[PDB]
Symmetry: none
Subunit: 121 residues, 4 copies
């Protein structure tokens, strides 16, 4: 589970600062600082007015961003789907048989040499 939440809370951080690089000059509403690039991306993440409210409007300026928004969403929904489903899995549902065998082998090397040793005789 929470071995993905590090990935995610860097993705969040990663994308945010591109958006703050790109947009703050013309959408300081949403992207002037991390302080709301987070909010924004949090909201984008959430799928309330991501396109019509944020993106379509971002894109009237920068078609550069078309993907920023589609990309972020796919990834965001995946790396949550991935973590979300890693709590149905890691909530609901072998090397004491390498230790069984890899001495059961040492038991047959012991026998094959305690037979080979009973051979010279």
């Amino acid at each position: 589970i929470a071995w993905i939440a590090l990935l995610l809370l860097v993705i969040f951080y990663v994308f945010a600062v591109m958006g703050t690089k790109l947009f703050a000059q013309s959408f300081p509403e949403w992207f002037g600082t991390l302080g709301a690039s987070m909010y924004t991306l949090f909201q984008v993440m959430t799928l309330e007015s991501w396109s019509m409210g944020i993106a379509r409007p971002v894109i009237e300026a920068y078609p550069w961003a078309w993907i920023y928004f589609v990309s972020f969403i796919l990834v965001s929904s995946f790396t949550v789907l991935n973590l979300f489903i890693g709590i149905i899995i890691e909530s609901m549902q072998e090397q004491r048989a390498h230790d069984e065998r890899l001495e059961m082998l040492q038991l047959i090397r012991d026998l094959s040499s305690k037979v080979d040793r009973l051979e010279r005789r």
Copy 2:
């Protein structure tokens, strides 16, 4: 399952009355009484126009609410995720191999003690 729905339907109640303390000064639309602080939070909970419709606007006035909304949502989605997943779990839900080998070993010590 429903041992969480008590927690949830207090969280709902909890957050609502802060919001009615805070906002039902300047957003009596949404937060003047519980009567729509519930609705509002229900809608916030639901993620239809939570930010753009409610929060961003709440926050144009009070930036201390910034978190109220983000906090509520995280918790809300969790304590539903927790209860939701407590109905996949609370709806749905060997030594033979070791025995086969750990006497197959005792069979080869038996054989290897075939000695003079």
Copy 3:
């Protein structure tokens, strides 16, 4: 699974015609006929502008409806949650190892009798 989709596609039908009784007076946009009471409820079901777009506005007129919308949503999301989860359940819910071993045993009863042979008939 589909023993609930009858319940659901009656709930849909049920609620719609109350809404068409109630509202297709004053919200014939959304509730004038089933033809968009369905759409509307489908959209309400979907949680795009259910409140701000449909309900808060329905309710400026009829506070009667406050619940219509909250009630429908709870039930709707449930009787889908119920059917949705009835396709994780009604979709979902070590032999070669016992054939490896249970002749590897027959190989060692073979050896312990191919030695019971020849220690004994050697010396």
Copy 4:
């Protein structure tokens, strides 16, 4: 899992070009080219302002689109539900131990023949 993502990323492609046939006359905002028929459908797929923002407005012109939007959504949500649930299934519900045993067997055929190799050593 990804044997459905081909179906889906054709459904996406399929519907888009009907929408571009139909609408990129009168809704070139959303449907003038694939370049935003995709976006649009992506956004429709996502359920942000699909009805109120896109469809209800598409349909003020063409009521034959009524279904285009309801149909796409049902299918879209299904063929994602189908693929989504194909990663709970194909995630939830051992050949360095067929190489352990199937030479540990070849070790006991070796021994049973290096014992039967003083069995032929009486004859």
